[PDB]
Design an enzyme around this catalytic site. Structure first.
Site, short mmCIF file in Angstrom:
data_model
loop_
_atom_site.label_atom_id
_atom_site.label_comp_id
_atom_site.label_asym_id
_atom_site.label_seq_id
_atom_site.Cartn_x
_atom_site.Cartn_y
_atom_site.Cartn_z
N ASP A 33 0.84 -1.18 0.00
CA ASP A 33 0.00 0.00 0.00
C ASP A 33 0.89 1.25 0.00
OD1 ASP A 33 -1.66 2.22 0.79
OD2 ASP A 33 -3.09 0.86 1.72
C1 LIG Z 1 2.81 14.62 16.79
C2 LIG Z 1 1.89 15.22 15.73
C3 LIG Z 1 0.60 14.42 15.58
C4 LIG Z 1 -0.19 14.84 14.34
C5 LIG Z 1 -1.51 14.10 14.20
C6 LIG Z 1 -2.24 14.47 12.91
C7 LIG Z 1 -3.57 13.74 12.76
C8 LIG Z 1 -3.40 12.23 12.66
C9 LIG Z 1 -4.73 11.52 12.36
C10 LIG Z 1 -5.15 11.68 10.90
C11 LIG Z 1 -6.63 11.40 10.69
C12 LIG Z 1 -6.93 10.84 9.30
O1 LIG Z 1 -6.69 9.71 9.06
S1 LIG Z 1 -7.63 11.91 8.02
C13 LIG Z 1 -8.33 10.86 6.71
C14 LIG Z 1 -8.22 11.57 5.36
N1 LIG Z 1 -9.16 11.01 4.41
C15 LIG Z 1 -8.87 9.73 3.78
O2 LIG Z 1 -7.87 9.15 4.04
C16 LIG Z 1 -9.85 9.14 2.76
C17 LIG Z 1 -9.25 8.51 1.51
N2 LIG Z 1 -7.87 8.13 1.77
C18 LIG Z 1 -6.94 7.97 0.67
O3 LIG Z 1 -7.30 8.16 -0.44
C19 LIG Z 1 -5.49 7.58 0.95
O4 LIG Z 1 -4.73 7.79 -0.20
C20 LIG Z 1 -5.38 6.10 1.34
C21 LIG Z 1 -6.49 5.29 0.66
C22 LIG Z 1 -5.50 5.98 2.85
C23 LIG Z 1 -4.03 5.56 0.88
O5 LIG Z 1 -3.98 5.63 -0.51
P1 LIG Z 1 -2.85 4.75 -1.33
O6 LIG Z 1 -3.34 3.32 -1.45
O7 LIG Z 1 -2.67 5.33 -2.71
O8 LIG Z 1 -1.54 4.78 -0.59
#
Ligand SMILES: CCCCCCCCCCCC(=O)SCCNC(=O)CCNC(=O)[C@H](O)C(C)(C)COP(=O)(O)O
Ligand SMILES: CCCCCCCCCCCCCCCCCC(=O)OC[C@H](COP(=O)([O-])OCC(O)COP(=O)([O-])OC[C@@H](COC(=O)CCCCCCCCCCCCCCCCC)OC(=O)CCCCCCCCCCCCCCCCC)OC(=O)CCCCCCCCCCCCCCCCC
Ligand SMILES: CCCCCCCCCCCCCCCCC[C@@H](O)O[C@H](CO[C@H](O)CCCCCCCCCCCCCCC)COP(=O)(O)OCC[N+](C)(C)C
Ligand SMILES: CCCCCCCC/C=C\CCCCCCCC(=O)OC[C@H](COP(=O)(O)OCCN)OC(=O)CCCCCCC/C=C\CCCCCCCC
Ligand SMILES: CCCCCCCC/C=C\CCCCCCCC(=O)O[C@H](COC(=O)CCCCCCC/C=C/CCCCCCCC)COP(=O)(O)OCCN
Lengths: 178, 55, 70, 63, 128, 219, 88, 104, 459, 84, 124, 175
Positions: free
Chosen positions: G43
């Site tokens: 992935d």
């Molecule tokens: C110390 C600092 C801490 C910071 C924390 C920041 C926040 C952390 C938590 C984040 C919350 C989330 O997940 S926010 C979630 C954002 N929305 C999505 O992920 C929906 C669709 N995802 C995709 O399309 C991606 O590409 C995917 C399929 C995953 C991979 O694709 P590949 O197959 O092409 O690799």
């Protein structure tokens, strides 16, 4: 760096960039290896609970709130590699990079030393001299009307041809010239 | 007579000799850092004497 | 100016006996000096003259009259 | 040998030059080199005069 | 529910916190495409002028000359006396002068008065 | 004014140093804190004691920077302590030199730093001066001990965290001799100087027992 | 420094060494020309984790624009060699 | 221009500038060697408040400690010869008032 | 004094009779010989002066200026040798003739026992400089610059002439000796106020004073290298020499008439030092630095104390040398870049290390690093102003800091950093340029050994 | 003279989670239903000469034993030499 | 500290302000009034040129310590008895200063008590 | 050395203590002094002797210039340019002599400050009073004249000072 940029970044690219930044700042926060591995797996899991989100208007709200969270806990003194744009030795050897054309200004007494290197230097200069004349025509014929859209250059397509605009990329001084 | 002033000025002036020699041939060789280190060590050894006299 | 030491790539680097014995000797001399100075000169940390108590002094030596003469 | 020649061409010659310059040119003019007068303690003897300095007044020594 | 970041003039707002880098519209994508197109045109022109082996000089940048001319030799022809300009010029060109004049005049008046009355202790003030 | 400036300088620099991650930055803030302490000494009318502290600080802080530079060179131009792990055994001479230097910095008794800093503390405790400055000086000494502990713990105690290509090497006579001379200095020069100079100030002969140990207790 | 002049063989060996310690990839099936999501079924998050693992392995960090298109061990080796100016 | 992309291949890598692109009016103010407006981890207002609050608190506490000093339960030091009149200032032709010290 | 004036005059027939490929050698050699001869005037005496004749006399204020003027010409010839290579022989001879005429006028101006002759030569210096600026100037603005450089000056000095003759109608003579010995105070009157203004504004404009300095950036930017040398080094000191000569009759009115000029100079030093911080041109930066230094000299002259005069003289000499060297370095960079912009050429210490060393030394000298004569004059004027008023130091201190800033800025932007990739016509520095730099910088470090030679008559 | 000896990489199968604090991380992650794939890549930091660690107080008392022995023998020699 | 806390948290009047000490005549305590004795004269103490702050009642021991240090230079730790005597004399001087502090404190306490008793008696 | 007059620049008798070695331990200071003499002072002394005997073979003298006294500005006509010139030059020479007198006094004060060590506050009273008197007289003479000082301006300053003193004396005596 070596790759040309695009007009915009897709949602996938932004998600990957946020994931990499979060991992880097987490390992900056978690100094030790076992603690970092545990918390990195935990954060990958919490980042993975919304992989299969389908609607784009909801997946963009998740990353938008993830960028508000990362900023709050971003470790105002992160770890930076020494040669990175923020590292302690970023441009340490930048003053030792002397251009190749400077060798054209050497005195004949200095060029008496190192004869083979200079012979190879005129060989390279002649090669470039014909190659550039070929590349002007190649790049003029391959460009689309109205000008290029992205700054990506085509390779060489014939046998004896060389990639257009190659002289200043292959003749980089060195990583650590001195 | 009066070795104190002579030695105190001599350490400072012998700290200056490599600066004058920086235009000579030794500056173009790899013996320059060792030359400067030896000069500094000799200056320290010479300046150890006025400290003893004051003490 | 030294000896030839090879890279390890995930193993403990080569150590010569000279550096180990030198570091151990220097630490031993440091601790021996600390102990020797503490034994021979112990008043530099605890003091030599006791701190007098102001309350233990009697009024005879302090020029105090029993609140009637003046 | 290297240290022998170094101590002559880098130490001895500056000492000679400065000693000459201070002894015969700097001190030729008044007040160029001024020395803080040496400390004087009871019981000492001055070389120039030879008279002995009176001692203390035998303060009561007890602990 | 985290504290919110407030951008300032000397501490701007991060790109990832931009509320305009999400509400994306096809017009925004078209604008980005045109920006990339003109940037690529300029880059191609510079690279064509840069890798030429027959060039033995400086590649003249019209942007640099235009910037220098705008900063130096174009200020006056576009100048118009306006209340804002007039007040700012009067302030920045007159106020400091009178302020320093008043300060130095007061100091020297006090000094001269103390000279005349006589208690200033001017001993050893030989070289002036 | 000098006393207040020195106190605020030493406190602020120690508080900044306690939480940094670059070794060179931490040692620089340590130098600034020591300079602030010497300015406090000047402010309490003890110039000769400040000069003595200058003399001892030269030795041990120069050797501390030398050890830091040796660590950086042996570790492929790395300065951040997050990528410094187990160097107590991987490179022992620098470890023992830095331990001696940190002990001298914190005013461990009968070292080069004790014979100056201890007198600084005794003089500032028994002087009709600002009480806030005295409190700031005590907190600054505690914070000095604290970031010395931080350096040792984060650079020599834990498991290794550097890139796998190990290139640790101290076997060079120049480095060893240069460090060992400053070791001999930071061990004996304080005693030699203190016992070999004429007295230039009145001594604090008497001392409350708790006040005598205040520097040691806070460290 | 006294750092040896790492070669192409050393770079490839270290790349394969890092990849084999990643237990999500079968050690007996991985090859120098093996693709990530196709030959190994990985992935994108695993790809960026491999990128960061190599980043820590070699002591330098690859920009995201170049990292998000390094898909084979051979081209990762070639990218590192081009960055470090390796002759042979 | 400090916060421009450090990984793009600029035609002027030190300045982070491109050939042809319009130069900012105040370019010489923003040359990575001068004032930079890069975003900070902490908001500017909060940093300003914390900095000036710390400075003001330090100054006020220094003034308070000046009002309430710290000393030892002792009297002033006693110097024998008329409070060292001859050795501090001189003037031996005035014969000042003698001061005697009370032995306890 | 004729033993130096006559060879300067004979320089003209020698140049006009020389071969088409040997004019530069003859001019340089004979100019250096004339400078060696003029070095004899440096042997001043604590007594009155070296009164050669009824027309010419030499003082320890005139002697260093004369020596500097004689020494400047060979440097200007070496600087102009390059950009006049493709010039016809007649026009090169005309250029050398203009330079020789300017030196002759300056030499006759610096002795000038009589004040009307001093004014006549003071304005005679205006013609060759104008011709040089307007004829051999590269850009199109030169003509306008020349106009400015003319009219400002004349606008300052046309009243002075009237004042001068008025004095001779009342005093009866304009000989500086008789003027000094028969000095009488100026009463507090409107007529005396306007006479003071007429006498002072003539030399204020050429120094220049802040607010009257608009001609100077134009004249220095648009002029050729030799013109910039002569304007920055010697032609600026004419105002200071004139003020120190003419303030002998303005007392005690100056004690209250110097307030506007003191305020203007003490604020204009800060204003121009801050202007130097944000400048897109090297020549403009050097010109504004010259304005700041001349404003400090104006402050010194207006204070009117012995330390003020000593510092003013030393600062004039040191500033002339330093500004000449800085203009030479800027021209050497320009002759390769052909752009005259600070940020186009960068990272030059990688390509020209000795030129980088020369830049560092020139910047340090401008930065007033002890024990240079620059800082000798700086400290003398600063202490004199402190005696005048304890608050002035504040402004002065600010100026010093700002000075260093822009100086190092000029050193850092042009020399440090990464070189410009698309500039491949940076040839190694010639022996001529390095010799010019050495001949500029060595006299400064030799004069710092014997400061009394440039400390003026009040030493 | 340089360090060119053709150093060969060690075998990759020796790196194991066993005997390391990565065991605790793996147990804590499995208690929730997760696994750490990069565990073995950092095994070398706990395998060889880095297996044993020293405490802060143990680090401070690096040469306490030899120094104490030297102090004891020196004070004994002083006692036996002064008493004469 | 205890004195600082008592002065800054209780009543300021009962305990002295060290700047104005002493506030009572020396002869208030006892009439014999033994004077302090100095053994170092003007000329010898000036010749030793110790320091202005070192020219106190403890001068003779400091002079002896300087003399023994000058006499036996190479073995610097030769004279330690003289250093101990000087330290003891400084300790005695400090004890005298503390005795003066406590004496002034008790005189002020007695004065306050007497004033309070007189006011109470006069009130009735 | 007899090069300078000892009365103009006085020095104390410079009494120094005799060595008093308490122990038998040989100090390094005396050995270093002896060796420094041995291989420094002897070659320097020989070189100076050679130079001096070379100088003695060629002996010639130079003379101090004496200046006659000329009428001052107080007996000079209003427009007599020659007498005014002579008076001005004499006044300038006297001003230089006064400056050098102040310089001599300052040098003596600095030498006293250095020589007396810690007791400089007491043992340098006489030099301090001499410098105070000389500085006060010099300030009364030449201070505040300006850059364009002259004999006439100093005479006017003195006349104003005498007028003020005469007014004060007339007011006080008649009171
Ligand atoms: C110390 C600092 C801490 C910071 C924390 C920041 C926040 C952390 C938590 C984040 C919350 C989330 O997940 S926010 C979630 C954002 N929305 C999505 O992920 C929906 C669709 N995802 C995709 O399309 C991606 O590409 C995917 C399929 C995953 C991979 O694709 P590949 O197959 O092409 O690799
Ligand atoms: C410390 C005293 C030393 C005395 C020994 C004798 C020294 C004689 C020097 C005379 C002047 C130098 C000539 C200037 C141009 C240099 C020529 C050149 O091309 O260099 C290449 C040449 C060969 O190298 P290269 O590899 O072929 O060239 C490659 C590049 O050039 C790359 O070049 P680079 O990277 O090697 O750099 C060039 C170098 C050289 O370039 C310079 O910048 C040198 C000039 C520095 C002065 C800057 C102006 C400020 C005003 C100071 C005025 C002092 C003058 C005093 C009288 C001098 C008489 C002429 O720059 C520096 O080293 C930095 C200088 C900053 C020093 C700041 C401290 C100044 C005050 C110090 C005290 C002075 C008075 C003492 C009074 C009390 C004690 C008695 O190198 C040298 O010759 C260097 C010479 C030594 C540097 C001197 C710096 C301090 C000395 C100043 C004068 C001495 C005072 C007298 C007291 C003596 C006791
Ligand atoms: C622009 C770049 C710089 C160029 C030069 C600028 C400096 C020029 C200024 C010249 C000096 C000041 C001008 C007048 C000085 C006279 C003294 C005056 O300032 O003091 C008061 C005078 O008050 C008023 O100034 C009176 C005159 C008012 C009318 C004059 C116009 C003032 C503003 C004009 C500004 C225009 C500037 C540009 C001109 C082209 C005190 O009044 P009083 O003590 O009783 O009389 C003094 C004169 N006495 C003793 C001879 C009798
Ligand atoms: C008084 C000073 C007045 C202010 C001076 C303004 C000067 C403007 C021109 C400066 C040139 C620009 C410049 O230097 O660049 C800014 C540069 C960049 O910062 P970095 O941290 O290095 O960034 C690196 C990471 N990227 O920062 C600087 O060097 C400039 C700093 C100027 C500080 C000005 C404020 C000083 C205040 C002083 C107060 C103390 C008063 C006395 C205290 C007690 C003394 C008894
Ligand atoms: C860069 C621009 C600078 C321009 C010059 C600025 C200075 C101008 C000063 C005035 C110029 C002429 C002054 C006259 C020369 C002195 C002669 C003199 O003092 O004689 C006076 C004559 O005084 C005058 O005539 C002065 C009148 C002024 C006429 C010209 C006016 C010019 C503008 C005036 C305002 C400018 C002042 C400030 C300028 C600031 C700088 C721009 C006395 O005459 P008597 O009749 O013999 O005696 C009377 C008792 N029987």
């Amino acid at each position: 760096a070596f790759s040309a940029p695009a007009a915009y970044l897709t949602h996938q690219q932004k998600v990957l960039r946020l994931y990499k930044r979060a991992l880097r700042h987490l390992e900056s926060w978690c100094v030790h290896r076992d603690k970092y591995r545990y918390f990195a797996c935990l954060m990958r899991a919490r980042f993975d609970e919304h992989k299969n989100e389908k609607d784009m208007v909801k997946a963009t709200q998740l990353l938008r709130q993830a960028e508000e969270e990362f900023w709050y806990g971003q470790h105002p003194q992160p770890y930076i590699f020494p040669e990175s744009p923020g590292g302690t030795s970023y441009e340490r050897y930048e003053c030792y990079k002397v251009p190749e054309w400077c060798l054209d200004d050497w005195h004949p007494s200095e060029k008496a030393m190192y004869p083979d290197y200079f012979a190879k230097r005129e060989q390279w200069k002649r090669l470039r001299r014909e190659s550039w004349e070929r590349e002007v025509k190649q790049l003029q014929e391959e460009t689309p009307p109205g000008g290029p859209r992205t700054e990506a250059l085509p390779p060489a397509r014939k046998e004896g041809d060389l990639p257009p605009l190659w002289w200043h990329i292959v003749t980089r001084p060195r990583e650590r010239p001195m | 007579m009066n070795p104190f002033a002579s030695l105190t000025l001599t350490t400072l002036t012998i700290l200056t000799i490599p600066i004058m020699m920086s235009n000579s041939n030794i500056y173009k060789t790899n013996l320059y850092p060792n030359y400067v280190k030896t000069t500094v060590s000799y200056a320290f050894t010479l300046s150890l004497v006025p400290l003893l006299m004051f003490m | 100016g030294g000896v030839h030491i090879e890279p390890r790539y995930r193993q403990f680097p080569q150590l010569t006996r000279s550096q180990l014995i030198q570091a151990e000797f220097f630490s031993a001399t440091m601790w021996f000096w600390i102990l020797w100075r503490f034994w021979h000169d112990s008043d530099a940390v605890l003091g030599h003259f006791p701190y007098p108590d102001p309350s233990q002094w009697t009024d005879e030596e302090l020029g105090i009259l029993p609140d009637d003469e003046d | 040998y290297r240290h022998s020649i170094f101590a002559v061409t880098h130490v001895l010659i500056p000492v000679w030059i400065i000693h000459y310059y201070l002894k015969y040119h700097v001190t030729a003019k008044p007040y160029t080199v001024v020395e803080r007068k040496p400390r004087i303690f009871p019981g000492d003897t001055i070389l120039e005069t030879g008279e002995v300095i009176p001692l203390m007044k035998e303060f009561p020594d007890q602990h | 529910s985290f504290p919110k970041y407030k951008p300032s003039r000397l501490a701007t707002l991060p790109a990832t916190l931009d509320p305009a880098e999400y509400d994306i519209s096809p017009e925004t994508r078209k604008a980005q495409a045109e920006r990339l197109a003109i940037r690529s045109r300029l880059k191609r022109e510079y690279l064509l002028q840069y890798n030429d082996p027959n060039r033995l000089g400086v590649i003249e940048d019209p942007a640099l000359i235009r910037w220098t001319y705008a900063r130096s030799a174009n200020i006056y022809p576009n100048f118009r006396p306006t209340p804002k300009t007039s007040l700012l010029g009067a302030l920045f060109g007159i106020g400091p002068l009178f302020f320093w004049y008043y300060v130095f005049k007061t100091d020297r008046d006090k000094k001269e008065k103390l000279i005349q009355e006589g208690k200033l202790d001017q001993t050893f003030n030989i070289s002036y | 004014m000098t006393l207040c400036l020195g106190a605020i300088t030493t406190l602020f620099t120690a508080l900044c140093a306690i939480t940094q991650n670059d070794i060179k930055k931490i040692v620089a803030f340590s130098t600034s804190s020591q300079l602030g302490l010497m300015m406090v000494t000047i402010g309490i009318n003890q110039p000769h004691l400040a000069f003595l502290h200058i003399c001892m600080h030269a030795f041990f802080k120069a050797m501390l920077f030398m050890c830091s530079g040796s660590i950086i060179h042996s570790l492929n131009d790395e300065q951040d302590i997050r990528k410094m792990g187990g160097l107590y055994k991987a490179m022992p001479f620098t470890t023992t030199a830095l331990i001696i230097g940190s002990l001298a910095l914190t005013g461990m008794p009968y070292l080069t730093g004790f014979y100056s800093k201890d007198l600084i503390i005794e003089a500032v405790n028994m002087s009709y001066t600002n009480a806030w400055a005295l409190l700031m000086t005590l907190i600054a000494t505690s914070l000095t001990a604290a970031y010395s502990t931080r350096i040792i713990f984060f650079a020599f105690l834990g498991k290794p965290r550097f890139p796998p290509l190990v290139l640790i090497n101290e076997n060079n006579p120049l480095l060893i001799n240069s460090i060992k001379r400053l070791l001999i200095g930071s061990i004996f020069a304080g005693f030699i100087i203190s016992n070999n100079i004429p007295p230039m100030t009145v001594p604090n002969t008497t001392m409350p027992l708790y006040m005598k140990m205040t520097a040691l207790i806070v460290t | 420094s006294d750092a040896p002049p790492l070669t192409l063989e050393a770079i490839k060996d270290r790349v394969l060494y890092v990849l084999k310690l990643y237990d999500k990839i079968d050690p007996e099936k991985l090859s120098v020309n093996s693709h990530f999501m196709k030959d190994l079924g990985l992935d994108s998050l695993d790809q960026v984790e491999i990128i960061m693992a190599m980043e820590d392995e070699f002591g330098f960090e690859i920009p995201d624009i170049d990292a998000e298109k390094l898909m084979c061990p051979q081209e990762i080796v070639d990218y590192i060699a081009d960055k470090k100016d390796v002759y042979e | 221009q400090q916060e421009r992309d450090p990984w793009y291949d600029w035609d002027h890598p030190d300045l982070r500038l491109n050939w042809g692109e319009p130069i900012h009016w105040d370019l010489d103010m923003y040359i990575r060697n001068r004032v930079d407006t890069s975003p900070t981890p902490v908001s500017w207002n909060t940093m300003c408040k914390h900095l000036f609050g710390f400075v003001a608190f330090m100054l006020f506490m220094f003034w308070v400690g000046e009002i309430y000093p710290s000393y030892q339960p002792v009297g002033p030091k006693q110097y024998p010869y008329n409070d060292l009149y001859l050795e501090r200032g001189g003037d031996p032709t005035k014969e000042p008032e003698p001061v005697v010290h009370y032995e306890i | 004094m004729l033993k130096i004036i006559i060879p300067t005059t004979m320089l003209l027939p020698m140049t006009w009779m020389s071969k088409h490929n040997m004019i530069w050698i003859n001019a340089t050699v004979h100019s250096l010989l004339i400078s060696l001869i003029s070095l004899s005037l440096l042997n001043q005496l604590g007594e009155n002066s070296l009164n050669f004749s009824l027309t010419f006399f030499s003082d320890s204020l005139s002697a260093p200026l004369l020596v500097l003027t004689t020494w400047l010409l060979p440097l200007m010839l070496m600087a102009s040798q390059s950009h006049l290579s493709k010039e016809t022989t007649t026009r090169k001879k005309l250029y050398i003739t203009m330079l020789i005429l300017l030196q002759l006028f300056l030499i006759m101006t610096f002795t000038a026992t009589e004040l009307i002759l001093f004014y006549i030569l003071f304005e005679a210096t205006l013609v060759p400089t104008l011709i040089i600026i307007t004829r051999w100037g590269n850009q199109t603005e030169r003509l306008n610059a020349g106009l400015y450089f003319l009219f400002y000056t004349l606008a300052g000095s046309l009243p002075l002439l009237v004042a001068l003759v008025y004095i001779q109608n009342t005093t009866g003579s304009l000989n500086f000796l008789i003027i000094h010995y028969w000095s009488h105070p100026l009463s507090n009157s409107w007529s005396n106020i306007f006479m003071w203004l007429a006498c002072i504004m003539a030399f204020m404009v050429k120094m220049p004073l802040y607010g009257l300095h608009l001609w100077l950036p134009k004249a220095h930017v648009e002029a050729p290298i030799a013109g910039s040398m002569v304007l920055a080094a010697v032609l600026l000191k004419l105002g200071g020499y004139g003020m120190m000569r003419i303030t002998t009759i303005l007392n005690p009115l100056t004690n209250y008439m110097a307030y506007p000029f003191l305020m203007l100079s003490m604020w204009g030093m800060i204003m121009t030092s801050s202007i130097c911080l944000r400048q897109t041109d090297l020549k403009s930066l050097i010109a504004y630095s010259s304005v700041s230094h001349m404003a400090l000299v104006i402050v010194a002259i207006m204070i009117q104390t012995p330390w003020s005069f000593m510092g003013a003289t030393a600062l004039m000499i040191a500033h002339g040398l330093t500004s000449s060297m800085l203009f030479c370095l800027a021209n050497t960079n320009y002759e390769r870049v052909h752009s005259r912009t600070m940020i186009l050429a960068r990272g030059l210490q990688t390509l020209l290390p000795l030129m980088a060393t020369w830049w560092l030394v020139a910047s340090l000298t401008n930065l007033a690093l002890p024990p240079s004569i620059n800082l000798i004059g700086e400290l003398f004027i600063i202490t004199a102003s402190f005696s005048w008023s304890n608050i002035t130091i504040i402004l002065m201190g600010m100026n010093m800091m700002i000075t260093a800033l822009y100086s190092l800025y000029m050193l850092i932007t042009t020399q440090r950093g990464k070189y410009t990739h698309h500039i491949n016509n940076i040839k190694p520095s010639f022996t001529r340029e390095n010799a010019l730099m050495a001949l500029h910088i060595l006299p400064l470090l030799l004069l710092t050994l014997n400061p009394k030679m440039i400390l003026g008559p009040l030493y | 003279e340089h360090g060119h000896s053709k150093m060969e990489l060690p075998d990759y199968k020796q790196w194991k989670i066993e005997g390391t604090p990565l065991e605790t991380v793996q147990e804590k992650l499995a208690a929730r239903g997760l696994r750490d794939p990069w565990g073995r890549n950092e095994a070398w930091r706990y395998s060889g000469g880095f297996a044993n660690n020293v405490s802060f107080v143990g680090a401070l008392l690096k040469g306490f034993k030899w120094g104490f022995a030297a102090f004891v023998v020196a004070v004994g020699a002083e006692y036996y030499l002064e008493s004469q | 500290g205890a004195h600082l806390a008592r002065r800054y948290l209780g009543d300021a009047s009962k305990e002295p302000d060290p700047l104005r000490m002493p506030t009572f005549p020396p002869d208030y305590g006892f009439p014999e009034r033994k004077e302090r004795e100095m053994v170092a004269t003007q000329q010898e103490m000036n010749d030793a040129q110790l320091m202005l702050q070192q020219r106190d009642y403890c001068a003779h021991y400091l002079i002896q310590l300087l003399k023994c240090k000058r006499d036996s230079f190479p073995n610097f730790l030769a004279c330690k008895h003289e250093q101990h005597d000087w330290d003891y004399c400084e300790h005695l001087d400090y004890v005298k200063r503390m005795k003066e502090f406590e004496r002034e404190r008790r005189l002020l306490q007695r004065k306050k008590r007497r004033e309070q008793r007189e006011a109470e008696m006069a009130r009735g | 050395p007899d090069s300078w007059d000892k009365d103009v620049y006085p020095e104390p008798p410079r009494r120094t203590p005799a060595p008093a070695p308490q122990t038998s331990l040989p100090n390094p200071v005396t050995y270093l002094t002896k060796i420094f003499d041995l291989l420094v002072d002897r070659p320097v002394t020989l070189a100076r002797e050679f130079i001096e005997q070379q100088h003695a073979k060629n002996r010639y003298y130079y003379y101090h210039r004496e200046f006659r006294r000329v009428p001052d500005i107080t007996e000079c006509e209003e427009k007599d340019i020659l007498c005014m010139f002579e008076a001005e030059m004499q006044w300038r020479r006297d001003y230089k002599v006064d400056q050098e007198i102040v310089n001599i006094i300052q040098e003596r004060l600095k030498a006293c400050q250095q020589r007396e060590g810690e007791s400089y506050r007491q043992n340098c009273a006489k030099e301090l009073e001499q410098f105070t008197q000389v500085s006060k007289a010099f300030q009364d003479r030449y201070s505040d004249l300006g850059a364009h000082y002259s004999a006439r301006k100093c005479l006017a300053k003195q006349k104003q000072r005498m007028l003020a003193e005469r007014k004060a004396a007339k007011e006080a005596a008649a009171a």
